[PDB]
Amino acid sequence: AEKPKLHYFNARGRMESTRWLLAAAGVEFEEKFIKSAEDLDKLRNDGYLMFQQVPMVEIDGMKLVQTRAILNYIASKYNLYGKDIKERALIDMYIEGIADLGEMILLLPVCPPEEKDAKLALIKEKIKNRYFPAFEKVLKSHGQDYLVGNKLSRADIHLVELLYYVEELDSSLISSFPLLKALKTRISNLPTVKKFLQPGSPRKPPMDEKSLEEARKIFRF
Amino acid sequence: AEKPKLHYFNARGRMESTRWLLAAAGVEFEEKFIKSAEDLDKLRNDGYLMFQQVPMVEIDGMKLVQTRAILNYIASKYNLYGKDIKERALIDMYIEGIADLGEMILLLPVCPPEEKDAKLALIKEKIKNRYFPAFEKVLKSHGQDYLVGNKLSRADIHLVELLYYVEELDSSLISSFPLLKALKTRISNLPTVKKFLQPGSPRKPPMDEKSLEEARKIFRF
Ligand SMILES: N[C@@H](CCC(=O)N[C@@H](CSC(=S)NCCc1ccccc1)C(=O)NCC(=O)O)C(=O)O
Ligand SMILES: N[C@@H](CCC(=O)N[C@@H](CSC(=S)NCCc1ccccc1)C(=O)NCC(=O)O)C(=O)O
């Protein structure tokens, strides 16, 4: 049990940001894929899940649930959480904006069909007018290669992950954000992240209809 | 030196857990209330809001947005975030469960009238069968006065705040969790918290009709 062990169903979902961070940190992990409501109930009954939910990661003797608890620990453990409390505040402020946007995109597929169009348009408007400007502005103001402390952090990893999902959405959205483009390229070419982006890795594909129906079967929603 | 300043409207909303945490830490703070969309637009134009939203807290030379960024910083600063990353992992796991429940309760008032009762019922069920059981188990597990590290942390503060909102919802819900009942009593009698719970503190009341209108008008939803 040297490898962290990720419990989740076979999809990006709430576990993918953790997959990215671990990979960018060069940490190898195992994944135990939930395939059925029965598998989830198994974990639930063996007392593995504090709030009866996944994501859960077995790491360092712990059974960590809650996405942010997992990410925070992993980021600290591998020195990707800034150097002090004030760097951490910037990292936290940045990645919480990223989380807000990411949550909107993550849930788009379960928007009621009569709300789907307006929600997509809202997401595009916020990307254009709120989130991309905010992060371009940060890069522009210190001119450095990384978001915080002139050094690779979880913030660059989380943001670049999001850039890939926005590109899947509408490849034109990032067009007028040169600094964001540059960041995506630099980060994507880091050896650990390059390897994750390449075919064959544990990186997961966009959720399709089949996958969405598996999640409804498993999590009973 | 300079007191923290809390930028929000005059309500609990997303700023109340910050008010609790600062107050519990014995930190005096000031509030600048937003009363109109025009006040919000000023903070925006002034460049004070990274994502054009509040909560915003001015603290130690930073304009901190994002509830979790704010709370994380304050928790670390006043030694309420555990003594090592393993304790922070437990704290994070606990408080993210508290966040999940708090979010359901926070947004209850903006449920459409034909969803209000169903949603309320779900909440009560999750309190009774998922969340209170988890936190009671943690307390029963080590038998100590505080959730983590045998010492006051943000987890105790965030939980007890939540126990007060649950009491407003349905005073019977806590009835079969003696350790939670006793935690609430103990934390409520810490000098700093006791003063916050007394009249005249920055502690805010439950949202009533007018408050909600002020919120729609101000934040344009
Ligand atoms: N705040 C928690 C949330 C955990 C959570 O919601 N877990 C889900 C599983 S996570 C999820 S549903 N993954 C897919 C998300 C998704 C669904 C549909 C379309 C797109 C994405 C779960 O366990 N449900 C069972 C239950 O609560 O009884 C966290 O961040 O870890
Ligand atoms: N993830 C962010 C979210 C901040 C946020 O949503 N702020 C709202 C204001 S906070 C909120 S609306 N508080 C009221 C809570 C409430 C809502 C509905 C019913 C009852 C209470 C805002 O600024 N909206 C304007 C905009 O996005 O353009 C954070 O935690 O800080």
Numbering used by the authors:
A (entry chain B), B (entry chain A): 2 to 222
What does the original paper state about this entry?
Glutathione S-transferases (GST) are involved in the metabolism of PEITC by catalyzing its conjugation with glutathione (GSH). The dimer is required to maintain the functional conformations at the GSH-binding site and xenobiotic substrate-binding site in each subunit. Here, we report the crystal structures of hGSTP1 and hGSTA1 in complex with GS-PEITC (hGSTP1:GS-PEITC and hGSTA1:GS-PEITC, respectively).
We determined the crystal structures of the hGSTA1:GS-PEITC and hGSTP1:GS-PEITC complexes at 1.93- and 1.95-Å resolution, respectively. In the hGSTA1 dimer, the Cys112 pair is located near the entrance of the solvent channel at the subunit interface. Indeed, the formation of Cys112-PEITC in hGSTA1 did alter the catalytic activity significantly, leading to more than two orders of magnitude inhibition in vitro.
